[PDB]
Amino acid sequence: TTKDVIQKGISVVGDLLGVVGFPFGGALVSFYTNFLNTIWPSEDPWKAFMEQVEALMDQKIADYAKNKALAELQGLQNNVEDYVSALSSWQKNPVSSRNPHSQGRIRELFSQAESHFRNSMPSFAISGYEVLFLTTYAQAANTHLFLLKDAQIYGEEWGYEKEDIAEFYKRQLKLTQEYTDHCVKWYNVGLDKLRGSSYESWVNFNRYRREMTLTVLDLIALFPLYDVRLYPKEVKTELTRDVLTDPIVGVNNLRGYGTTFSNIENYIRKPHLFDYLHRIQFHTRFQPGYYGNDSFNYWSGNYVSTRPSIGSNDIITSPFYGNKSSEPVQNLEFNGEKVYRAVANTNLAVWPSAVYSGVTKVEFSQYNDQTDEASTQTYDSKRNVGAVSWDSIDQLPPETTDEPLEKGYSHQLNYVMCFLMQGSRGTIPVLTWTHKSVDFFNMIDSKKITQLPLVKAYKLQSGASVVAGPRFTGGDIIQCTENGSAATIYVTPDVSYSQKYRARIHYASTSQITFTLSLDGAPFNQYYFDKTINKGDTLTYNSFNLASFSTPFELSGNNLQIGVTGLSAGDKVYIDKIEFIPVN
Numbered sequence: 001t002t003k004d005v006i007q008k009g010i011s012v013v014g015d016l017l018g019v020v021g022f023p024f025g026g027a028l029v030s031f032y033t034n035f036l037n038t039i040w041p042s043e044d045p046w047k048a049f050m051e052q053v054e055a056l057m058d059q060k061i062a063d064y065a066k067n068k069a070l071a072e073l074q075g076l077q078n079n080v081e082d083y084v085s086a087l088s089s090w091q092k093n094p095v096s097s098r099n100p101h102s103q104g105r106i107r108e109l110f111s112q113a114e115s116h117f118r119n120s121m122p123s124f125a126i127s128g129y130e131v132l133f134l135t136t137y138a139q140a141a142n143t144h145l146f147l148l149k150d151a152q153i154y155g156e157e158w159g160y161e162k163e164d165i166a167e168f169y170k171r172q173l174k175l176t177q178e179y180t181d182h183c184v185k186w187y188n189v190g191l192d193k194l195r196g197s198s199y200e201s202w203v204n205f206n207r208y209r210r211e212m213t214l215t216v217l218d219l220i221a222l223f224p225l226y227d228v229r230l231y232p233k234e235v236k237t238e239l240t241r242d243v244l245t246d247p248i249v250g251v252n253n254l255r256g257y258g259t260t261f262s263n264i265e266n267y268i269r270k271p272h273l274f275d276y277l278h279r280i281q282f283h284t285r286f287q288p289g290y291y292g293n294d295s296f297n298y299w300s301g302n303y304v305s306t307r308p309s310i311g312s313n314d315i316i317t318s319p320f321y322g323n324k325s326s327e328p329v330q331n332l333e334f335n336g337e338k339v340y341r342a343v344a345n346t347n348l349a350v351w352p353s354a355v356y357s358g359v360t361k362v363e364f365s366q367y368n369d370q371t372d373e374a375s376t377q378t379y380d381s382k383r384n385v386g387a388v389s390w391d392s393i394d395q396l397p398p399e400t401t402d403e404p405l406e407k408g409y410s411h412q413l414n415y416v417m418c419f420l421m422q423g424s425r426g427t428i429p430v431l432t433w434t435h436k437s438v439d440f441f442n443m444i445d446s447k448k449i450t451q452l453p454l455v456k457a458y459k460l461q462s463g464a465s466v467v468a469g470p471r472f473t474g475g476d477i478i479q480c481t482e483n484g485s486a487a488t489i490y491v492t493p494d495v496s497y498s499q500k501y502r503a504r505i506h507y508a509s510t511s512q513i514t515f516t517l518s519l520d521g522a523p524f525n526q527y528y529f530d531k532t533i534n535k536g537d538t539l540t541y542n543s544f545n546l547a548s549f550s551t552p553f554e555l556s557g558n559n560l561q562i563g564v565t566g567l568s569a570g571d572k573v574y575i576d577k578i579e580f581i582p583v584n
Helices: 003-016 025-038 043-057 063-092 100-124 134-154 162-193 199-220 261-265
Strands: 242-244 275-287 296-308 330-333 338-351 354-368 373-380 387-391 411-420 427-435 449-453 465-467 477-480 484-490 500-509 513-519 522-529 545-548 559-565 573-583
Touching (some): 003 025, 003 134, 003 199, 025 063, 043 063, 043 199, 063 100, 063 134, 100 134, 134 199, 199 242, 199 261, 275 411, 296 338, 296 354, 296 411, 296 427, 330 373, 354 427, 484 573, 500 513, 500 522
Antiparallel strands (some): 242 427, 275 296, 275 330, 338 354, 338 387, 338 411, 354 373, 411 427, 449 573, 465 477, 484 559, 500 545, 500 573, 513 522
């Protein structure tokens, strides 16, 4: 259910990934037309976003608050549409028809929309309804900020005063911090409100977490890239966070046999360096039916193997999950294949005073980006398979319904974990996914500013570790507590000639520090960096700083190592991303 808003959410993020940083005029206008058709066509989408959280929270917005919100949104729609039509004409029209008279038309259409946004935002954050208005606020906030950056692109062309463009920029910086912080604060409020002890509690908790990730968290992660002054070129970036699909179960009500909240939540994958699905070992067991005729085999447990990020080849194999096989083991390999879909069959046997159900068949759809072709691999219990009851596409829709699935999908399989039901009445499989934007090769683009998340490293050292991200960076981060090396990340240059680059680092630190960069073991850059937080502070938007290294360099190697020094006992440094700026 609610796949509609989930698709809109996934699509917007997918489209924005193409116009992030300083976009080319034609691309910007193209985006805007889809944007209007997706998010700003009528009040239906906004109403659906409200109902979405109401469904997750099992609460409703007071009708008065709901009606006003919808009213503001209708007005904002007109402002956005009037603005886009005009912007479209401006881009299309040559630098000749641009007379003082048309400049003032676009200038006031823009000022109106921007102003209307600041006036309306409070309506999507009324006391007591903050969490329920979250996806609506997120989408409105996004629009407001995306709109704002246009003033830095076309400001002078439109004939705005130097003072005006500057006021708009400072306003953009203030709002990027506020909107981001607002979303994370209430996201967490909602998350905690759903924590329970039962299996049913965890499904709700995790569904909220996944849906808020796709519609809110992924979105706010892009906000900083709207700063066309800091990002004067197109930006190549990726979202590294995990999302778990709903558990695969054959029955709607488990009558208390579902795995407990803590036995699921405490065992799912913890903050880890990025990796890829490599192999799966299926274990099968026989489930007898009370009358023999109604028996079936089912997936009882599993092993999972993943390969690390580029630069390392040693395969990581998971502990055993679930119950050992009573039947012959099945192994599926994925070497390089991208699993973009998983469809499952489940079956049930009704006993006098018990019901037994399990996953009997799983069909995986894979795409080989090397040999540009799709195919399927499947697990079959072999005895009484039943019907399909679970489709990943329902939870993780494609970015585009235009292209074929192997091209338009939004996520790929990263992990499989089997949980045991209470009193071991069965097995509950849980699947973890990662975003399609993740570049396996860690490729440094020669024309764009490339953002490289530290979790893409293949090797951590000196006691460095992966820590939960602050919810606004698109993924997890690296925590450094000691002086010395920290991480080694493998890099793939996209060109052959001696292209030069400048490096920038997005970090947080409790003290003044020194970052050192090495290529294949040789230092090439070392610089001093400011303290951004106090010991014990929680990480909010302003905790992070983005600072450049002085000197330019060439990528005469592949193994980039980041080292830190200047730490004292109790000092901590958090590293989010390293950026590469193509320089002449």
